[PDB]
């Protein structure tokens, strides 16, 4: 009775509680073939991949993981530098988990915060990856360097959620269900929840309802403003580029990704932010093609 | 029986609810001399002037007003452009209030949002003013032009409160007393509430406890992100400068200095401006009342 009996949106997939030095990672595991790890972002959990994972599982062993501190993964204790919720730390943790599953090398696709984990993992440990896909992001450095009025107003949450505790946490606590539902609605094409399966929205809402989970999300954004930014700035100063074959998908950027990656393909997808849920067929097909190439 | 029973922070001053075409303005009115309007900002009310008002009342008729929609002033119905909470509209409304009081010309000092009212009023209607003082600000345009990663983190509320309704309103409902007290403390030198009279803090808390009042504040920040910025941008493109004799005061550790040297910015905006720092954070009249009152008295007064 320690976990809610939420809807199963991955029929046929198993459940794994994977040990790491920073805590357990929860994942769904399905398919057969070369390993492909899929990482969600904010304010979601691993269930966001439920419409694309079955297709991918024809050709790949698909591992659909809750990021450190999100969903059902354990929540390591943070510190004043937000260390465990840095993308560098999260990447190291997820490497530990994949090694538990039998995989020293793997393919990787990430969305939003999970895409940030993914490009940081590719910078820090490129040898771990066969191929990388990032969905609807630019590097964290790039978002901050372009900060001006227009962006401050659009991505206000990068600066609000990064304010020192307990400010955002005390505000999110009033009506968390409103905040989470309006965030998911507002960055879809339609501007409503019609794109999401209601069972998926329930997973998101149940996660967001827990104050400890919301504190993790704020620590993630505090890393995003500080350590993650400094980590990216070090790579910019040395002109470091990802050598892993990469695919950048975005909701209707490749020019930004060339500065950061020496072998990058891209495509627009007819979607708002939430590509795997808004445009599952088009997203699945792009990823299937990319990851099947050798 | 609905009012709280609170001590008078302006002994000797009258209390007036002044009619305008947009709604009443509440003000305390004291002293003797030519008129001087004082305009507070966020998340405050007219009581923020309570430590400098007595000194200024020695030589001036001091009119200490709650901004449109703040404190005890009426809340004009907003619209999609947040018109009544634009600094242009607030300026027009406070001009109506001063005219009802019998003052077609006056001297003006403003802090924070009230300083934004005040420079907009000087741009739009310079003939109304004898002298202008702005405290701890640069023009809205200048903050936005400097809105990089560091400033986006420091003055996050400029972007947060400007999100479309009901996002910030619903969040602020989460713990409004914490929010206002944290805002007030964060912009002080000590980083706590020790600079403020606890009785003034209670005024600010009571105001902020009201959801209709918090909605006004958000509309003010929406105006600050949109129409107020555009109105500034028009003047900057034209090279329009404030012609009124002006004073810019700022905190040595306040908001305006954070990403600028303020006197040189104001010289881009004003042809007859003087300025100086005050040893303070953002809340000059409460953190540094003696220094601030002296500066103000010297600037507005013809006597040394
Ligand atoms: Cl490596
Ligand atoms: Cl005029
Ligand atoms: Ni259990
Ligand atoms: Ni009553």
Q: Please list, in sequence order, all residues whose beta carbon lies within 8 angstroms of the beta carbon of residue B133, skipping any fewer than 6 positions away.
A: B108, B109, B110, B118, B246, B247, B248, B249, B296, B299, B300
Are B8 and B44 in contact by the 8 Å Cβ rule? The answer is: no
Q: Smallest Cα–Cα separation from B95: which of B58, B112, B120, B70?
A: B120
Name residues with Cβ closer than 5 Å to ligand 4, which is an ion: B 1-2
Question: CB B147 to CB A145 under 8 A?
Answer: no
Per-residue 3-state assignment (H helix, E strand, C coil) for chain A: CCCCCCCCCCCCCEEEEECCCCCCEEEEEEECCCEEEEECCCCCCHHHHCCCHHHHCCCCEEEEECCCCCCCCCCCCCCCCCHHHCHHHHHHHHHHHHHHCCCCCEEEEEECHHHHHHHHHHHHCHHHEEEEEEECCCCHHHHHHCCCHHHHHHCHHHHHCCCCCCHHHHHHCCCHHHHHHHHHHHCCCCCCCCCCCHHHHHHHHHHHCCHHHHHHHHHHHHHHHCHHHHHHHHHHHCCCCECCCEEEEEECCHHHHHHHECCEEEEEECCCCCHHHHCHHHHHHHHHHHHHCC
Going from the Cα of B2 to the center of ligand 4, the distance in angstroms, rounded, reads: 3
Question: CB B171 to CB A167 under 8 A?
Answer: no
Phi/psi of residue B210, nearest 5 degrees:
-90, 115
Chain A: give the shortest CA distance to residue B176, in Å: 8
Chain B: give the shortest CA distance to residue A140, in Å: 11
The closest CB to that of A156, out of B149, B159, B173, belongs to B159
Question: CB B156 to CB A159 under 8 A?
Answer: yes
Are A9 and A47 in contact by the 8 Å Cβ rule? The answer is: yes
Measured distance CA(B46)–CA(B65) in Å, rounded: 5
Q: Which 3 state secondary structure label does DSSP give B197?
A: coil
**Considering only alpha carbons, which residue of chain B is nearest residue A141?**
B149
CB atoms closer than 10 angstroms to residue B131: 18
Going from the Cα of B122 to the center of ligand 2, the distance in angstroms, rounded, reads: 8
Q: Smallest Cα–Cα separation from B91: which of B67, B111, B127?
A: B67
Ligand nearest to the CA of A5: 3
The closest CB to that of A147, out of B147, B167, B179, belongs to B147
Whether residue A116 is annotated as binding a ligand: the answer is yes
Residues of B in contact with A152 (CB under 8 A): 147, 152, 158-159
Q: Which 3 state secondary structure label does DSSP give B274?
A: strand
Radius of gyration over every alpha carbon of chain A, rounded to an integer in angstroms: 18
Whether residue A113 is annotated as binding a ligand: the answer is yes
Measured distance CA(B226)–CA(A150) in Å, rounded: 10
| Angle, CA A187 vertex, CA A181 and CA A192 arms, to 5° | 55
Measured distance CA(B137)–CA(B52) in Å, rounded: 19
Beta strands A61-65; A106-111: pairing state:
unpaired
Chain A: give the shortest CA distance to residue B274, in Å: 29
Count CB pairs under 8 A between chains A and B.
73
Name residues with Cβ closer than 5 Å to ligand 3, which is an ion: A 1-2
Measured distance CA(A9)–CA(A6) in Å, rounded: 9
Whether residue A149 is annotated as binding a ligand: the answer is no
The residue among B146, B171, B230 with the most chain A CBs within 10 A of its CB, best to mutate, is B171
Extract the tokens encoding B151: 């400033």
Going from the Cα of A3 to the center of ligand 3, the distance in angstroms, rounded, reads: 5
Which residues of A form the catalytic set? 112, 273
The closest CB to that of A159, out of B159, B182, B225, belongs to B159
Beta strands B25-31; B61-65: pairing state:
antiparallel
Q: Please list, in sequence order, all residues whose beta carbon lies within 8 angstroms of the beta carbon of residue A196, skipping any fewer than 6 positions away.
A: A184, A188, A204, A274, A277
Ligand nearest to the CA of B1: 4
Q: Which 3 state secondary structure label does DSSP give B17?
A: strand
Measured distance CA(A66)–CA(A50) in Å, rounded: 13
Give the length of chain B. Answer: 304
Helices A211-225 and A227-237: crossing angle in degrees, nearest 10, is 30
CB atoms closer than 10 angstroms to residue A195: 20
Are B77 and B86 in contact by the 8 Å Cβ rule? The answer is: no
Measured distance CA(B49)–CA(B149) in Å, rounded: 33
Q: Which residues of B68-82 are buried (b: 16+ CB within 10 A; e: fewer)?
A: bbbbbbbbbebeeeb
Extract the tokens encoding B206: 């009571």
Q: Smallest Cα–Cα separation from B63: which of B18, B93, B23, B21?
A: B18
Measured distance CA(A138)–CA(A120) in Å, rounded: 12
CB atoms closer than 10 angstroms to residue A288: 16
Going from the Cα of A68 to the center of ligand 3, the distance in angstroms, rounded, reads: 20
Which residue is associated with the tokens 């009152």?
B293
Question: CB B153 to CB A178 under 8 A?
Answer: no
Residues forming beta bridges with residue B111, ordered by sequence position:
B135
Q: Which 3 state secondary structure label does DSSP give B275?
A: strand
Chain B: give the shortest CA distance to residue A49, in Å: 28
The closest CB to that of B167, out of A162, A182, A229, belongs to A182
DSSP character at residue B278: E
Interface of B with A (CB under 8 A): 144-145, 147-149, 152-153, 156, 158-160, 162-163, 167, 170-175, 178-179, 182, 225, 229
**What DSSP letter does each residue of B40-51 carry, written as one string?**
--TT--GGGGTT
Measured distance CA(B187)–CA(A7) in Å, rounded: 47
Are A246 and A131 in contact by the 8 Å Cβ rule? The answer is: yes
Beta strands B25-31; B273-278: pairing state:
unpaired
Are B170 and A175 in contact by the 8 Å Cβ rule? The answer is: yes
Sheet strands side by side (includes A25-31)? A14-18, A25-31, A61-65, A35-39, A106-111, A129-135, A246-251, A264-269
Which residues of B form the catalytic set? 112, 282
Q: Smallest Cα–Cα separation from B44: which of B147, B173, B175, B180?
A: B180
Measured distance CA(B39)–CA(B119) in Å, rounded: 12
Q: Smallest Cα–Cα separation from A206: which of A169, A172, A177, A184?
A: A177
Q: What domains does chain B contain, in order, with CATH numbers?
A: 1-304 (3.40.50.1820)
In the annotated binding site of B, the residues are: 113, 116, 157-158, 221
Measured distance CA(B157)–CA(B163) in Å, rounded: 10
Q: Is the N-terminal amide bond of A189 cis, ω within 30° of 0?
A: no
The residue among A82, A150, A153, A166 with the most chain B CBs within 10 A of its CB, best to mutate, is A153
Whether residue A158 is annotated as binding a ligand: the answer is yes
CB atoms closer than 10 angstroms to residue B236: 15
Residues of B in contact with A184 (CB under 8 A): none
Are B129 and B107 in contact by the 8 Å Cβ rule? The answer is: yes
Q: Smallest Cα–Cα separation from A46: which of A62, A31, A59, A32?
A: A62
Are B115 and B230 in contact by the 8 Å Cβ rule? The answer is: no
Are B114 and B73 in contact by the 8 Å Cβ rule? The answer is: no
The answer to whether the Cα torsion of B11, B13, B14, B16 is positive or negative is: negative
Q: What is the resolution of this structure in A?
A: 1.6
Going from the Cα of A25 to the center of ligand 3, the distance in angstroms, rounded, reads: 16
């Amino acid at each position: 009775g320690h976990m809610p009996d939420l809807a199963d949106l991955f029929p046929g997939f198993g459940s794994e509680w994977i040990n790491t030095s920073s805590g357990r990672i929860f994942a769904r595991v399905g398919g057969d073939g070369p390993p492909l790890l899929l990482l969600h972002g904010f304010p979601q959990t691993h269930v966001m991949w439920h419409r694309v994972a079955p297709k991918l599982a024809e050709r790949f062993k698909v591992i659909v993981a809750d990021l450190p501190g999100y969903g059902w993964s354990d929540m390591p204790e943070s510190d004043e530098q937000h260390t465990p919720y840095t993308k560098r730390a999260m990447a190291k943790q997820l490497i530990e988990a994949m090694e538990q599953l039998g995989h020293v090398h793997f393919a990787l696709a990430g969305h939003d915060r999970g895409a940030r984990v993914s490009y940081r993992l590719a910078l820090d440990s490129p040898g771990r990856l066969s191929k990388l896909a990032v969905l609807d992001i630019l590097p964290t450095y790039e978002y901050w360097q372009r900060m001006n009025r227009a962006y401050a107003l659009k991505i206000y949450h990068w600066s609000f959620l990064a304010q020192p505790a307990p400010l955002p946490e005390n505000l999110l606590g009033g009506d968390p269900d409103f905040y989470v539902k309006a965030k998911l609605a507002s960055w879809t094409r339609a501007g409503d929840l019609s794109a999401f399966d209601p069972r998926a929205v329930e997973h998101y809402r149940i996660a967001f309802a827990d104050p400890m989970r919301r504190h993790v999300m704020c620590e993630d954004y505090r890393a995003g403003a500080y350590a993650d930014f400094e980590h990216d700035k070090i790579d910019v100063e040395a002109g470091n580029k990802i050598p892993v074959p990469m695919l950048a998908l975005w909701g209707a950027p490749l020019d930004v990704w060339r500065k950061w990656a020496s072998d990058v393909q891209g495509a627009p997808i007819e979607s708002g932010h939430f590509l795997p849920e808004e445009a599952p067929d088009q997203t699945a097909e792009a990823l299937v093609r990319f990851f099947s190439a050798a």
